[PDB]
Amino acid sequence: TGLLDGKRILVSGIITDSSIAFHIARVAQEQGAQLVLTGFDRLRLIQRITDRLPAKAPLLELDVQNEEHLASLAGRVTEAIGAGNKLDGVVHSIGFMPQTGMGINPFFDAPYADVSKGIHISAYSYASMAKALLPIMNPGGSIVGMDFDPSRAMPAYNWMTVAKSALESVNRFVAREAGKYGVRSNLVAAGPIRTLAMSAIVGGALGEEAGAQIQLLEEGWDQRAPIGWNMKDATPVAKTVCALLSDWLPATTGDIIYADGGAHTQLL
Amino acid sequence: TGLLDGKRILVSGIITDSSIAFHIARVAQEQGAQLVLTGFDRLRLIQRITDRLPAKAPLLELDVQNEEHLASLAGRVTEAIGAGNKLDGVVHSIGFMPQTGMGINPFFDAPYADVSKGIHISAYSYASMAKALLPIMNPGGSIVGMDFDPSRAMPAYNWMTVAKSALESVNRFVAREAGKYGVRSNLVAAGPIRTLAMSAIVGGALGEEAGAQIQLLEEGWDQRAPIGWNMKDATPVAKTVCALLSDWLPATTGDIIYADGGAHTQLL
Amino acid sequence: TGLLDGKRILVSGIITDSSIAFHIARVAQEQGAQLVLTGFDRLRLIQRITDRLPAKAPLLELDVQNEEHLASLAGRVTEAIGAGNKLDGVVHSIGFMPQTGMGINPFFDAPYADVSKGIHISAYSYASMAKALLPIMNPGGSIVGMDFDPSRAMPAYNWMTVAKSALESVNRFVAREAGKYGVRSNLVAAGPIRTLAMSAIVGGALGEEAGAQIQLLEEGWDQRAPIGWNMKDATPVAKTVCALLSDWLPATTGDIIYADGGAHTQLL
Amino acid sequence: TGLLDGKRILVSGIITDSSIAFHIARVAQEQGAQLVLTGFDRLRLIQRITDRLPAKAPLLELDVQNEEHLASLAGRVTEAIGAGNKLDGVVHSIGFMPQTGMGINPFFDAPYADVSKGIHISAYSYASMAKALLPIMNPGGSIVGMDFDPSRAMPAYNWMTVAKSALESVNRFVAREAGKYGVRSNLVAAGPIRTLAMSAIVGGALGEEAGAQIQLLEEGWDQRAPIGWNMKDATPVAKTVCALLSDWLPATTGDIIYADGGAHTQLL
Numbered sequence A, B, C, D: 001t002g003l004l005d006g007k008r009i010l011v012s013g014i015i016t017d018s019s020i021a022f023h024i025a026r027v028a029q030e031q032g033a034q035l036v037l038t039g040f041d042r043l044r045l046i047q048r049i050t051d052r053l054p055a056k057a058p059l060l061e062l063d064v065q066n067e068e069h070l071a072s073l074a075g076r077v078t079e080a081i082g083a084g085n086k087l088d089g090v091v092h093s094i095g096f097m098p099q100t101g102m103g104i105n106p107f108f109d110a111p112y113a114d115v116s117k118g119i120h121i122s123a124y125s126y127a128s129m130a131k132a133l134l135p136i137m138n139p140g141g142s143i144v145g146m147d148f149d150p151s152r153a154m155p156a157y158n159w160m161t162v163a164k165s166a167l168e169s170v171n172r173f174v175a176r177e178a179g180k181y182g183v184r185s186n187l188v189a190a191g192p193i194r195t196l197a198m199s200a201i202v203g204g205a206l207g208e209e210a211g212a213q214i215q216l217l218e219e220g221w222d223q224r225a226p227i228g229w230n231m232k233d234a235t236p237v238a239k240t241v242c243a244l245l246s247d248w249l250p251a252t253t254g255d256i257i258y259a260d261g262g263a264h265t266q267l268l
């Protein structure tokens, strides 16, 4: 039996088939969920990527900086899943930070206009998605967002670290609001996964130094993780997200589940 | 159907049918697990309690202060589940602290002999159970222990708070050892549940309930929890434990999952 | 002898004589420091307030959203303290959040334009001040910022909680940069102090619920604090800040010192 | 001049002139404090070491496992400082763990008798010292203990990590008791310092693995620390402790100050 049988779940943040969102969606479908997908900017490309999922699913446009998309989202979703039906799950797998706020680019030289855009998309949007979608969410439902442990500073993650620290704070306030609908809000702090963003945005910002990033990642995660960590395998992260969409973590909200091989609990 | 289909799991710490362990066991069985149970001291009584579980399960004696029980445990378990079979899960739901280290008894008046006994049973035993049982645990398996958030001091929990702080530290070292077997070790920080032990904390069971205690708990948990907290319902805690015994939190180890209605993420 | 004898220190964020910054400055002067002050918007008013300090000190205009002020700040400071002299200390005591992001105003109804302004002033500005002033800071020097524990969500603080979570993350990255100059960067997480911002901005946002605020504060701080907490006394906060400006916490950086009566260490 | 002028302070835990306690005591005396010292086992040796302090100070025997010493301590101290006088400060710089609970010795092979002794000395004793001495402590006074960040597991520290996790929990409860006397209780989480215990107890437990591990530590605490870290220099730790004994952190209790160069705030 599907862990998510007859749950209607919204999954944002697919762009390639390496995306964490893609694998969340794949696993969710294997576990009996009906999906609704959202995508940003490259809709024909995303469409061709989502056809590779095990089952057909509607795809809607959502740019989280666009007030009109947010205002119309609930309605467009209602249309896709049929009137008098609702979502049981929502997955926020979205992030962005301009090259100026990342990599070897000095921390101090990122102008606030750039930092602000990143916080808008990576942090604020968790609240605006919640605002838009809670009115069409069943009791017992689950909102989930993706996090990267920002509790200690680190090389290269720079201003995205600050956005994630903001996200953790937003998640806790969303939990309060979501509570009134009988809905949980949580984050998954994933270990590093080889995705588009990782390689092109993050590694891109190191240009010449890009080997250095792999040193940090090997050091901070697989070496520290008591059960190891594999950057080429999003499945453990995807399953962790599905666990939170399920009924099997019913007492957990405003919280962060670490899907990092346990790396964050070990110093060396 | 079963979240735990054909998993062989050991559950310690049943004494009444209010015990967290009893409900862990109940839910695990509903989810297709074959169980082995352990009990302390009152074996005939525990036996009569465990017959009330949905399915028959073998019951072994385990006093975690007794080196001979620990040395023989693996063997006795192997006998119960059949040679060439192994455990996929182990649940530590055990605790004790002498009256001197809890309730209105002044913190400074608890002699070390008493505190030591409590730390032995409540914290050290997590490691000694792990030591005894990992040699008969399959890769992919999960050890789980019960925690009560000791990160801030509080009235009455006194020296048990210290034992729990110790337990959290032990759990992280057990994760390292368990890692070598492909096994996860985690704690569930549960909210308050009306159990035998809980009533023994202030003034011994059989007393009227103890108003100050009940108020503190409602204050610290249901009021703070965005989704509420019900002390008479162990199901949400039991499900959280089963999620960690399952394959759906495969990347999480050395860690603490909060099953507390989200109370620990809200200040008031 | 002055704890801060012959230290040249910059203190931002004075607006009334209740301001935390005013008391930081007062205590610093009592302890032998030469000060340079910065103020926002109401310069004639601030000037009349700073004349009430024990000693004369130059006052400069600094609006942290204004790139020209930031670009010229180092120069204007150098002029005030004399060429070939430098700062040993910098105090960031600055914050802002539009009423939409605070109080009874629904969390989800604060538009990002408003939240962004608050994060700019309350969080980003810590970095931009550091960027501007480190080039004129002696080795052994100390940057300090003011924090309000955002690790758990709470009523009313709303989007300022998010700004503070961001600030904590920024402080850790500023520490890295400051390190290369032999300079420490830390935050003081203060308990509640009756200041202009507290009463007019925060209490203002509750309008008709403003009694609620005083109750929550007494509940979260004085009741929990083992040594008590007095909202009408900024001295303990000011002294804590001076300790970090001094040579007596030389091994502490990227960190948070709690000046809250110990409230954050007790559950209730 | 003195940060600690006319404060009467008790300093435990001197055994060599590399001991953290020795440097705490030295700095405290330079800052105008009258000291009372305590020592374990090797009294003639400790006596010859304490004569190297800048000023004469009485030396008392205290083995924290000995109930008779604890019962008589307050009286013996009163005798040393003169009747009708009291302590303003108490410093716990004490620790022990048998070789079985440390280094390359397997975590699971440390028998509880050994772990218990270490927790007794390293954790419980903080409370028993407090119990014995609070009755002779002035309002405004400060108790301080030494910590090593146990919040993440690590190689070699093993069961001492568990003792430190216990200590942090005890410190929070001692704060509550100390509060009733107007007294603060806090810990200093120090970075690594080359002391007798470090080299003989900890390094001893690595035997063959020893030299490499000391070099790694000096490299990594220092590499992570934005202001660096020098294991041969206890002054920064000693000053941090004096700051807590002083009047300049009056709002901090039940808490942990990190004197680690900021290493704990940086991931790499």
Ligand SMILES: NC(=O)c1ccc[n+]([C@@H]2O[C@H](COP(=O)([O-])OP(=O)(O)OC[C@H]3O[C@@H](n4cnc5c(N)ncnc54)[C@H](O)[C@@H]3O)[C@@H](O)[C@H]2O)c1
Residues within 6 Å of the ligand: A012, A013, A014, A015, A016, A018, A019, A020, A021, A039, A040, A062, A063, A064, A065, A092, A093, A094, A095, A096, A121, A146, A147, A148, A189, A190, A191, A192, A193, A194, A195, A196, A197, A198
């Ligand atoms: N890759 C990792 O190692 C890793 C680890 C932890 C957390 N995360 C987080 O996981 C999430 C997914 O990232 P990923 O690595 O799978 O990357 P990805 O780059 O494959 O996906 C990021 C997504 O953000 C979307 N997005 C960007 N701007 C948007 C906007 N304005 N409106 C809507 N969508 C927008 C993109 O369309 C894309 O689908 C992000 O929150 C990221 O921070 C990534």
Ligand SMILES: NC(=O)c1ccc[n+]([C@@H]2O[C@H](COP(=O)([O-])OP(=O)(O)OC[C@H]3O[C@@H](n4cnc5c(N)ncnc54)[C@H](O)[C@@H]3O)[C@@H](O)[C@H]2O)c1
Residues within 6 Å of the ligand: B012, B013, B014, B015, B016, B018, B019, B020, B021, B039, B040, B062, B063, B064, B065, B092, B093, B094, B095, B096, B121, B146, B147, B148, B189, B190, B191, B192, B193, B194, B195, B196, B197, B198
């Ligand atoms: N009830 C709650 O509110 C709550 C909440 C969070 C955590 N916990 C923890 O959950 C666990 C179970 O508590 P519970 O309240 O369900 O209690 P309980 O009613 O079962 O009380 C004690 C249990 O520990 C067992 N035990 C005691 N000493 C033992 C020994 N020497 N060897 C083996 N077993 C021994 C007893 O048989 C019994 O099963 C404990 O670790 C407790 O601290 C309880």
Ligand SMILES: NC(=O)c1ccc[n+]([C@@H]2O[C@H](COP(=O)([O-])OP(=O)(O)OC[C@H]3O[C@@H](n4cnc5c(N)ncnc54)[C@H](O)[C@@H]3O)[C@@H](O)[C@H]2O)c1
Residues within 6 Å of the ligand: C012, C013, C014, C015, C016, C018, C019, C020, C021, C039, C040, C062, C063, C064, C065, C092, C093, C094, C095, C096, C121, C146, C147, C148, C189, C190, C191, C192, C193, C194, C195, C196, C197, C198
């Ligand atoms: N009062 C409390 O209970 C409390 C508790 C903890 C922390 N804090 C923090 O301490 C700091 C000081 O606040 P306070 O309570 O003393 O308040 P306050 O209202 O007296 O001061 C706020 C200050 O912010 C300044 N400011 C606002 N926008 C600015 C800008 N663009 N550029 C420069 N300065 C600007 C104002 O001029 C004023 O001096 C803030 O960061 C606040 O968040 C306050």
Ligand SMILES: NC(=O)c1ccc[n+]([C@@H]2O[C@H](COP(=O)([O-])OP(=O)(O)OC[C@H]3O[C@@H](n4cnc5c(N)ncnc54)[C@H](O)[C@@H]3O)[C@@H](O)[C@H]2O)c1
Residues within 6 Å of the ligand: D012, D013, D014, D015, D016, D018, D019, D020, D021, D039, D040, D062, D063, D064, D065, D092, D093, D094, D095, D096, D121, D146, D147, D148, D189, D190, D191, D192, D193, D194, D195, D196, D197, D198
């Ligand atoms: N050395 C470090 O790197 C470091 C770092 C962080 C914390 N600490 C802590 O600092 C404290 C001092 O350790 P140190 O490194 O300075 O070591 P040290 O061995 O020089 O001093 C430890 C002290 O413990 C005392 N002691 C042991 N058992 C005792 C008992 N039964 N009764 C009384 N005293 C007893 C010894 O007399 C000795 O003075 C300890 O708590 C240690 O864990 C040390």
Ligand SMILES: Cc1ccccc1Oc1ccc(Cn2cc(C3CC3)nn2)cc1O
Residues within 6 Å of the ligand: A094, A095, A096, A097, A147, A148, A154, A155, A156, A157, A160, A191, A192, A193, A195, A197, A198, A201, A202, A213, A216, A217
């Ligand atoms: C989607 C996204 C946009 C902008 C920045 C990061 C983004 O997602 C992540 C991608 C990879 C990672 C993992 N990662 C972090 C790093 C830091 C360089 C050390 N390298 N990899 C985290 C993310 O949050």
Ligand SMILES: Cc1ccccc1Oc1ccc(Cn2cc(C3CC3)nn2)cc1O
Residues within 6 Å of the ligand: B094, B095, B096, B097, B148, B154, B155, B156, B157, B160, B191, B192, B193, B195, B197, B198, B201, B213, B216, B217
């Ligand atoms: C098993 C056990 C032994 C001794 C003390 C407590 C024990 O289990 C618990 C039972 C209830 C709780 C919850 N709790 C704590 C309190 C104290 C009032 C704070 N009341 N209930 C925690 C436990 O660890």
Ligand SMILES: Cc1ccccc1Oc1ccc(Cn2cc(C3CC3)nn2)cc1O
Residues within 6 Å of the ligand: B015, B016, B017, B018, B042, B045, B194, B195, B196, B197, B199, B205, B206
């Ligand atoms: C009475 C009571 C108070 C608090 C929690 C559960 C309670 O009910 C029971 C108490 C004990 C028992 C079984 N039991 C255990 C014991 C020995 C004390 C171990 N005696 N009886 C069953 C209950 O339903």
Ligand SMILES: Cc1ccccc1Oc1ccc(Cn2cc(C3CC3)nn2)cc1O
Residues within 6 Å of the ligand: C094, C095, C096, C097, C147, C148, C154, C155, C156, C157, C160, C191, C192, C193, C195, C197, C198, C201, C202, C213, C216, C217
């Ligand atoms: C400077 C400032 C601007 C906007 C909002 C708050 C500001 O400073 C603070 C004032 C009071 C406090 C403490 N506080 C918090 C609250 C909320 C009611 C819980 N009331 N006071 C923190 C601040 O950061």
Ligand SMILES: Cc1ccccc1Oc1ccc(Cn2cc(C3CC3)nn2)cc1O
Residues within 6 Å of the ligand: D094, D095, D096, D097, D148, D155, D156, D157, D160, D191, D192, D193, D195, D197, D198, D201, D202, D217
């Ligand atoms: C006093 C003492 C007794 C038993 C064990 C350690 C003791 O003191 C310490 C000495 C050094 C340190 C710091 N340290 C710990 C480690 C781990 C080996 C990697 N390296 N350095 C901490 C202590 O608590």
Ligand SMILES: [Cl-]
Residues within 6 Å of the ligand: A223, A224, A225, A226, A266, A268, B176
């Ligand atoms: Cl490891």
Ligand SMILES: [Cl-]
Residues within 6 Å of the ligand: A235, A236, A239, B250
């Ligand atoms: Cl997996």
Ligand SMILES: [Cl-]
Residues within 6 Å of the ligand: B041, B042, B043, B044, B045, B046
């Ligand atoms: Cl019996």
Ligand SMILES: [Cl-]
Residues within 6 Å of the ligand: B102, B103, B104, B105, B201, B202, B203, B204
């Ligand atoms: Cl009692």
Ligand SMILES: [Cl-]
Residues within 6 Å of the ligand: B194, B231, B232
């Ligand atoms: Cl109840």
Ligand SMILES: [Cl-]
Residues within 6 Å of the ligand: D059, D060, D061, D076
């Ligand atoms: Cl003596």
Ligand code: NA
Residues within 6 Å of the ligand: D222, D223, D224, D225, D226, D227, D228
């Ligand atoms: Na460094």
